[PDB]
Design a binder for these strands. Sequence first.
RNA 1: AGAGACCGAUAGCGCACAAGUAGAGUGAUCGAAAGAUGAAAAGCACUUUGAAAAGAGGGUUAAAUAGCACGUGAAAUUGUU
RNA 2: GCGUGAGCCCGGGUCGAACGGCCUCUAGUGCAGAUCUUGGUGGUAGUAGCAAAUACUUCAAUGAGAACUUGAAGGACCGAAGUGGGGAAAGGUUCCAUGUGAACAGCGGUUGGACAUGGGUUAGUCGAUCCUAAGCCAUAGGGAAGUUCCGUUUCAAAGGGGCACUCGUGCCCCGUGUGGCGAAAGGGAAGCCGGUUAAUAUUCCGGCACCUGGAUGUGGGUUUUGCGCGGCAACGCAACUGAACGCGGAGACGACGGCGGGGGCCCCGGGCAGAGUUCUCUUUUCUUCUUAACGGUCUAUCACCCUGGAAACAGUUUGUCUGGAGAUAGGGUUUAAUGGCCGGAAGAGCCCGACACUUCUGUCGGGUCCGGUGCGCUCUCGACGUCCCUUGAAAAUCCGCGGGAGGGAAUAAUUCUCACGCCAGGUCGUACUCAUAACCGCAGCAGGUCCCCAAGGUGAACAGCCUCUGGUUGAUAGAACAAUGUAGAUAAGGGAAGUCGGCAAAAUAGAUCCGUAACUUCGGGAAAAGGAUUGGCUCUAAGGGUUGGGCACGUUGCGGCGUGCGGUUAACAACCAACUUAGAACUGGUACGGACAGGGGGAAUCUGACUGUCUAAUUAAAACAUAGCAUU
RNA 3: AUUAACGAGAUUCCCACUGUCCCUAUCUACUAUCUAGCGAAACCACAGCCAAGGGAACGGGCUUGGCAAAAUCAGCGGGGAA
RNA 4: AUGUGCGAAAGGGUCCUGUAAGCAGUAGAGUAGCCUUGUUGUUACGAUCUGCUGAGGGUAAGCCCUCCUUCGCCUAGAUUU
Lengths: 50, 150, 87
Amino acid sequence: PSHKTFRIKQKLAKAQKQNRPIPQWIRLRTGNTIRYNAKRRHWRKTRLGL
Amino acid sequence: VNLRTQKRLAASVLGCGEGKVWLDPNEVSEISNANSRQSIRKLVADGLIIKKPVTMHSRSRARELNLARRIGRHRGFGKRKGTADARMPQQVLWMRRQRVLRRLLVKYRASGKIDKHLYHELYHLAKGNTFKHKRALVEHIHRAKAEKAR
Amino acid sequence: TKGTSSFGKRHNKTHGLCRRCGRRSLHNQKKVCASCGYPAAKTRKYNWSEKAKRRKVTGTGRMRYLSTVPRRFKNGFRTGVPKGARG
RNA sequence: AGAGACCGAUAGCGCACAAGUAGAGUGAUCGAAAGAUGAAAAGCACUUUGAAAAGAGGGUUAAAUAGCACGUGAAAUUGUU
RNA sequence: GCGUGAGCCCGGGUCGAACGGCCUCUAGUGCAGAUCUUGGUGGUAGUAGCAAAUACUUCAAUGAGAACUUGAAGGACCGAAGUGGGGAAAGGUUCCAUGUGAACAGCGGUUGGACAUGGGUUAGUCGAUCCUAAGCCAUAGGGAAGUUCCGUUUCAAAGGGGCACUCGUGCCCCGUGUGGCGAAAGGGAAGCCGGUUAAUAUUCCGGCACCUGGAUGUGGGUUUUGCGCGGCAACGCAACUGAACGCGGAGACGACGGCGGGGGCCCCGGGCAGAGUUCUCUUUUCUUCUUAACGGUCUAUCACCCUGGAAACAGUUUGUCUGGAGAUAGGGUUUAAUGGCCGGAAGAGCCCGACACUUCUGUCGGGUCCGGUGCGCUCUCGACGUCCCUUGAAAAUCCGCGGGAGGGAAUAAUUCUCACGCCAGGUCGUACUCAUAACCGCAGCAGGUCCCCAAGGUGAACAGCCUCUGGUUGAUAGAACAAUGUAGAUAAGGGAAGUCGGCAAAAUAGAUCCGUAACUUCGGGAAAAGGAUUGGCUCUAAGGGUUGGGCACGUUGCGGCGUGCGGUUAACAACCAACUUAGAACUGGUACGGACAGGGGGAAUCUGACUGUCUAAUUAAAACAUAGCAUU
RNA sequence: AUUAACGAGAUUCCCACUGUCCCUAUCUACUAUCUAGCGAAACCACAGCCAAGGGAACGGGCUUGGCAAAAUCAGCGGGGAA
RNA sequence: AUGUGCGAAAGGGUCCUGUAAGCAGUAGAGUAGCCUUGUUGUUACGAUCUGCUGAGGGUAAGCCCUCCUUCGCCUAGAUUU
Ligand SMILES: [K+]
Ligand SMILES: [K+]
Ligand SMILES: [K+]
Ligand SMILES: [K+]
Ligand SMILES: [K+]
Ligand SMILES: [K+]
Ligand SMILES: [K+]
Ligand SMILES: [K+]
Ligand SMILES: [K+]
Ligand SMILES: [K+]
Ligand SMILES: [K+]
Ligand SMILES: [K+]
Ligand SMILES: [K+]
Ligand SMILES: [K+]
Ligand SMILES: [K+]
Ligand SMILES: [K+]
Ligand SMILES: [K+]
Ligand SMILES: [K+]
Ligand SMILES: [K+]
Ligand SMILES: [K+]
Ligand SMILES: [K+]
Ligand SMILES: [K+]
Ligand SMILES: [K+]
Ligand SMILES: [K+]
Ligand SMILES: [K+]
Ligand SMILES: [K+]
Ligand SMILES: [K+]
Ligand SMILES: [K+]
Ligand SMILES: [K+]
Ligand SMILES: [K+]
Ligand SMILES: [K+]
Ligand SMILES: [K+]
Ligand SMILES: [K+]
Ligand SMILES: [K+]
Ligand SMILES: [K+]
Ligand SMILES: [K+]
Ligand SMILES: [K+]
Ligand SMILES: [K+]
Ligand SMILES: [K+]
Ligand SMILES: [K+]
Ligand SMILES: [K+]
Ligand SMILES: [K+]
Ligand SMILES: [K+]
Ligand SMILES: [K+]
Ligand SMILES: [K+]
Ligand SMILES: [K+]
Ligand SMILES: [K+]
Ligand SMILES: [K+]
Ligand SMILES: [K+]
Ligand SMILES: [K+]
Ligand SMILES: [K+]
Ligand SMILES: [K+]
Ligand SMILES: [Mg+2]
Ligand SMILES: [Mg+2]
Ligand SMILES: [Mg+2]
Ligand SMILES: [Mg+2]
Ligand SMILES: [Mg+2]
Ligand SMILES: [Mg+2]
Ligand SMILES: [Mg+2]
Ligand SMILES: [Mg+2]
Ligand SMILES: [Mg+2]
Ligand SMILES: [Mg+2]
Ligand SMILES: [Mg+2]
Ligand SMILES: [Mg+2]
Ligand SMILES: [Mg+2]
Ligand SMILES: [Mg+2]
Ligand SMILES: [Mg+2]
Ligand SMILES: [Mg+2]
Ligand SMILES: [Mg+2]
Ligand SMILES: [Mg+2]
Ligand SMILES: [Mg+2]
Ligand SMILES: [Mg+2]
Ligand SMILES: [Mg+2]
Ligand SMILES: [Mg+2]
Ligand SMILES: [Mg+2]
Ligand SMILES: [Mg+2]
Ligand SMILES: [Mg+2]
Ligand SMILES: [Mg+2]
Ligand SMILES: [Mg+2]
Ligand SMILES: [Mg+2]
Ligand SMILES: [Mg+2]
Ligand SMILES: [Mg+2]
Ligand SMILES: [Mg+2]
Ligand SMILES: [Mg+2]
Ligand SMILES: [Mg+2]
Ligand SMILES: [Mg+2]
Ligand SMILES: [Mg+2]
Ligand SMILES: [Mg+2]
Ligand SMILES: [Mg+2]
Ligand SMILES: [Mg+2]
Ligand SMILES: [Mg+2]
Ligand SMILES: [Mg+2]
Ligand SMILES: [Mg+2]
Ligand SMILES: [Mg+2]
Ligand SMILES: [Mg+2]
Ligand SMILES: [Mg+2]
Ligand SMILES: [Mg+2]
Ligand SMILES: [Mg+2]
Ligand SMILES: [Mg+2]
Ligand SMILES: [Mg+2]
Ligand SMILES: [Mg+2]
Ligand SMILES: [Mg+2]
Ligand SMILES: [Mg+2]
Ligand SMILES: [Mg+2]
Ligand SMILES: [Mg+2]
Ligand SMILES: [Mg+2]
Ligand SMILES: [Mg+2]
Ligand SMILES: [Mg+2]
Ligand SMILES: [Mg+2]
Ligand SMILES: [Mg+2]
Ligand SMILES: [Mg+2]
Ligand SMILES: [Mg+2]
Ligand SMILES: [Mg+2]
Ligand SMILES: [Mg+2]
Ligand SMILES: [Zn+2]
């Protein structure tokens, strides 16, 4: 809702800054094993608990 | 060419609905370059975007039927659906009549055609179901003053 | 009408976010956390669940102060600076 | 800190990996799957067909019957001869 | 090739780092079954199916590719208790622009609530913040081995107000009482109009205001004997001292009924502009013609005041109340604008026309009036009335009064609630959806989920049916018309013979006028039962409002009146306005509540008095409750 | 024990009405059906033509007979003690 | 595949309904105006009636006829024995 408290507002900001893919240069380092982002979230798939 | 943004912007500037916005079929390339509200206004002035008129809805048949009923044409027994009291309630008829009769008695008493002793007696007679209309009350007053003359 | 129809009327919250442990377990009307027992002085813990004890025991966090004690013990809790250092 | 007539990725701790993680539940709590290119990326320059994904040539390598859907590559089941 | 057998050995191919024979030792040591455990894969099978919510067609453009992309033109639906315009809970970027291979949108896809990169939420006036409610928890104390239980004013030494300071240190009054959390729908200080963006606005820009708190100077007011004048009165005026202590008012309250005033919407007539139709008709049909907060001024029910003294009792509401405890009547005072006029304000907004202009840019002329109607719809205010063994919150905050403490001028003084002037107003939310795709049901599910606004016609009507503003054209498609189905219907003659059973269907139905039984707790039964009428056109009759009334004196730019009178037009004249009811003639393939909408009825038995309630998802009842009665 | 009014409560008869029936016929829309695209599940020891016999006293398989010819589409409700 | 051919129209026949639009009238219950006051005095409104009119409309989609009406089409393309 438009009515929000500051604590909930702070949480929503962090949840969308953690929702971007990995940069390209990470995949070219020596001894790398990360392929994609395994913690991607979508508003239509998984519900975050507040 | 996709013109969904232009049609939405035109409706806001013209102050109409999006079903009343006309875009020139032969200038789609020129219209597609308009992205701001300022550019939409300029295309309105130049005549490539216009507002269409409303659809016709006339009351000619409605007020024609109303006039025919002022002379009693469509008010038979086969044209009534509600009850008599639903079409014309009795309480409204009674309220009108009492106001008419009470208006007359104040008029006569003020001018001088009757005095307070006759006014009071006629007032309670009107509260009872004595006088059918304005004419009946006036005839009763004349006979009352005729016999009072003797 | 139990079931699908009744599930549509769920738009309130029994629990909110606790100020001490961070879980969505604070009861809104009682004002008591169902996980850490806030606002009691002690933390809720039971011996009939070993899994629950290990999820929050010492060492599962940052150890901001306690992780530097072994090094200070080994050198004898000394103070000062090494000999002729500058400063 | 040192070891073993212990186990060798469906075994050994739930976890050899961004594992008490992702995910489920209003909640107390429940709780996985997932290791291996090559000595060295040398991870395929150029030409050609295609809208593109790609194919055919031509290259690297001891090996592409090792091409990142990557050591070896069994059975159920399927295609051609 | 060897062995009775479990097994052992060799050849050919693939492959890339370790492995075996013999004697002893040791064990988590030998699988077809346990509706066995984990993982992988078949037949069925290109099979069942992708059928609720009325529906699409033509041309052009984009593109490798178009039924489900965009433009224009046709045809349709939702039909103001909307498929419209905004919100509360819940979600959390779903909002906007640009671009796009795969995957997702159970057909396609150049489109997307999908994928990638950037952007977007502006407040002293809207909220939170302040107050208390049902309730929750500290303090004094008492229990309990203890985690802790009770207790909220109690069996408690429980507070706050002023004055100088040499400079804080020091003095002086009052005292019965003494915590916090708890409402984005309760209580509550203050903002309106126009414009502006791709995406925010009562928050930005322009104009015009208001509230609270704090300092303060001019003008005016009062006082020469100290704290204002006027009115018989109700009371009035720009001001017009007032401590402790006390009294009062506001905040502050139910449901229903008819009646009256005001704003908005609907409806009718005229005029200026523009548009549609025009074989024929139509002085025709449709659209615009607006005025905010904040102020000034003149008014508007109830009620109150002065004079006077009522029975031949009077006044008076749609609804019988009022008056010697003072009516009628005459004259006054006052609570209450969403009323009239003026400032704001035409300079704005809107409608036409004529020139410029690649763009940058625009420029200039006109207009923006006047009346009527109502058991109409919606909101608001007022005076009345009915109902109860039911009588319909609290606190913060603001004001008046009783009292008279302290203080003050005769050249100045003034703690004058009057006018104008100076300064400031912190913190958090604000995008978007609110649902046949943004919430909950495993999902883009025919289910569920609290509110505000509410047009024309028919009609008693928020009934059904058609239309305007606004919004959709979205639910995999093309071709054919077998059986059996699901949904919609009609049948000659007979009329329940069918069946456990008239189950399903059919028949009746609006309005006006006649007519209406047994029984009965006298209220009912009752729309009992049973009959007749209803269209179109041309006429006739009835039911109302406003304004005028003749002399004789004096004043007043036909005067309007101060009067002295006379009189009741055997009730006349002019003008204005909607509807409701009754009667007659004529007319038609005897039809007319012509669609929609819309009760089948009667004679009896069993049982519960009635209205109400329950087994969410197989039983709605004779079961439960109930008023009354009796017992403890 | 009676009882006016009331009832989506159980029962019997009468008038009107009708496809409930004699006795069945016809029409409309959506399916099924054919095509393009997309595309599951239940179930499955091995399988799938009969008559009799004996047998755990009702055979798809055994014994003696009848017979018996590729690959297939729309329906159906006897059996598979489904 | 040149035909007594096939197709699209049209004309006639046969059937179904029931007298079209338009114009006119010594028709029409009546009403309201204006004049020389009429033997039809005129101007306006009027459901309906009468004439042109057994008319107009429809007619094979699984009706009939047309060498005696008009316009078009034609000795292939592919696969197999
Ligand atoms: K495991
Ligand atoms: K969860
Ligand atoms: K080698
Ligand atoms: K090679
Ligand atoms: K290899
Ligand atoms: K070999
Ligand atoms: K397929
Ligand atoms: K549909
Ligand atoms: K629809
Ligand atoms: K604020
Ligand atoms: K300010
Ligand atoms: K807040
Ligand atoms: K505050
Ligand atoms: K309380
Ligand atoms: K205690
Ligand atoms: K509040
Ligand atoms: K902005
Ligand atoms: K002064
Ligand atoms: K004064
Ligand atoms: K209240
Ligand atoms: K009113
Ligand atoms: K009103
Ligand atoms: K009004
Ligand atoms: K109206
Ligand atoms: K205001
Ligand atoms: K009296
Ligand atoms: K009344
Ligand atoms: K209302
Ligand atoms: K004094
Ligand atoms: K906003
Ligand atoms: K908004
Ligand atoms: K909401
Ligand atoms: K209406
Ligand atoms: K209606
Ligand atoms: K069919
Ligand atoms: K059929
Ligand atoms: K029967
Ligand atoms: K029977
Ligand atoms: K009738
Ligand atoms: K009996
Ligand atoms: K009941
Ligand atoms: K039940
Ligand atoms: K019931
Ligand atoms: K019960
Ligand atoms: K009794
Ligand atoms: K019942
Ligand atoms: K079938
Ligand atoms: K198909
Ligand atoms: K047998
Ligand atoms: K045998
Ligand atoms: K005709
Ligand atoms: K005729
Ligand atoms: Mg009455
Ligand atoms: Mg609760
Ligand atoms: Mg130093
Ligand atoms: Mg070890
Ligand atoms: Mg594994
Ligand atoms: Mg493991
Ligand atoms: Mg591997
Ligand atoms: Mg290659
Ligand atoms: Mg190799
Ligand atoms: Mg593989
Ligand atoms: Mg391999
Ligand atoms: Mg195999
Ligand atoms: Mg190796
Ligand atoms: Mg074992
Ligand atoms: Mg096995
Ligand atoms: Mg075995
Ligand atoms: Mg199928
Ligand atoms: Mg469907
Ligand atoms: Mg279906
Ligand atoms: Mg479509
Ligand atoms: Mg409809
Ligand atoms: Mg409609
Ligand atoms: Mg969008
Ligand atoms: Mg896009
Ligand atoms: Mg798809
Ligand atoms: Mg596709
Ligand atoms: Mg796409
Ligand atoms: Mg996204
Ligand atoms: Mg406020
Ligand atoms: Mg307590
Ligand atoms: Mg204690
Ligand atoms: Mg509070
Ligand atoms: Mg409030
Ligand atoms: Mg101030
Ligand atoms: Mg005082
Ligand atoms: Mg004004
Ligand atoms: Mg005023
Ligand atoms: Mg008076
Ligand atoms: Mg003005
Ligand atoms: Mg103007
Ligand atoms: Mg918006
Ligand atoms: Mg909504
Ligand atoms: Mg839904
Ligand atoms: Mg959901
Ligand atoms: Mg009406
Ligand atoms: Mg179809
Ligand atoms: Mg049927
Ligand atoms: Mg019959
Ligand atoms: Mg018959
Ligand atoms: Mg009969
Ligand atoms: Mg029935
Ligand atoms: Mg009757
Ligand atoms: Mg009866
Ligand atoms: Mg009962
Ligand atoms: Mg049940
Ligand atoms: Mg039931
Ligand atoms: Mg047999
Ligand atoms: Mg036998
Ligand atoms: Mg068998
Ligand atoms: Mg045999
Ligand atoms: Mg069957
Ligand atoms: Mg069977
Ligand atoms: Zn907690």
